[PDB]
Symmetry: C2
Subunit: 95 residues, 2 copies
Amino acid sequence: SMLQSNEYFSGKVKSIGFSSSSTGRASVGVMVEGEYTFSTAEPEEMTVISGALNVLLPDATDWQVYEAGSVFNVPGHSEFHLQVAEPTSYLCRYL
Amino acid sequence: SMLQSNEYFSGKVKSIGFSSSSTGRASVGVMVEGEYTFSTAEPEEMTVISGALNVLLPDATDWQVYEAGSVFNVPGHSEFHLQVAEPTSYLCRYL
């Protein structure tokens, strides 16, 4: 199995990518305070492990605050937006 | 806030370290198939995010299988042992 460390946005997001039978392709990582735009290929399932994300999804008007334990889904071939206050850890699965 | 990528055991364990108000000092990471010995400073709280760990704790005889969603605690200044099959992601908090 391959594990790889990834960095995005000048180091403000860092993750470990992997693949397993139970998750499919996935990442676990952390984001620090900031505002970020992400583009998906496959649809993505995001789980907030610790901290919180303000989430704007493409097909719905309102931002929503997702605290630790919450899960949201992003469609494929789409753009979504996040805002972060305290460092926030997450699991992302590429569905 | 600082985020740092860490590698252990010749790359078989990789993690992102961070610190936040809700977690204290913590890591999120992934381990691949293998058997690992860890030494603690502070006591540690481990959460299995995906996959599974076979866990041997210092003050109890039996190994126990911790699957996704489960949480265990390791005392400080101690050694514990893990066995991994499929890649397994985790959150570790330094208490």
